[PDB]
Amino acid sequence: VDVQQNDSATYTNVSGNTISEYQRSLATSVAIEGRYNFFSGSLSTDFDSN
Amino acid sequence: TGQLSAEAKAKYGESISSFTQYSNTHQEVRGGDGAKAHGVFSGKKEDFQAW
């Protein structure tokens, strides 16, 4: 048997990192008024989406 | 004599973020003995000296 010295080392390192972020906002508002000498009217509407 | 008020409002927002990181490393050692040779991958001088 023929034995040869072969003292050796190898190293490898691979890493990946990722972040993804998405954001949305929506706002809506409506205000209405109505007037008559013997009547008053008001309406409001509000909407929010995230 | 009549009174009316009307209002409309809208707001919109969008935001996007992205991050990416990538690393690669490759080390190789020859000679000495393999067990001490693995020690140099610590990057620590005494282990490099031991190799």
Which residues of A are less than 8 Å from B51 in CB distance? none
Half-sphere exposure of B36 (CA within 13 A, CB side): 12
Strand ranges (E), chain A: 8-36, 39-49
Structure method: cryo-EM
Q: β-strand A8-36 against B4-30: which pairing, if any?
A: antiparallel
Q: What was the resolution (in A) of this experimentally determined structure?
A: 2.6
Sheet holding A8-36, edge to edge: A39-49, A8-36, B4-30
Query: CB-CB: which of B7, B10, B34 is closest to A9?
Result: B34
Q: How many contacts (CB atoms, under 8 Å) link A and B?
A: 119
Cβ-contact A23, B13 below 8 angstroms: yes
**Closest to B6 (Cα-Cα) out of A47, A19, A41, A2:** A41
Q: Distance between the two ends of chain A, CA-based, in angstroms?
A: 75
Q: Please tell me whether residue A40 adopts helix, strand or coil conformation.
A: strand
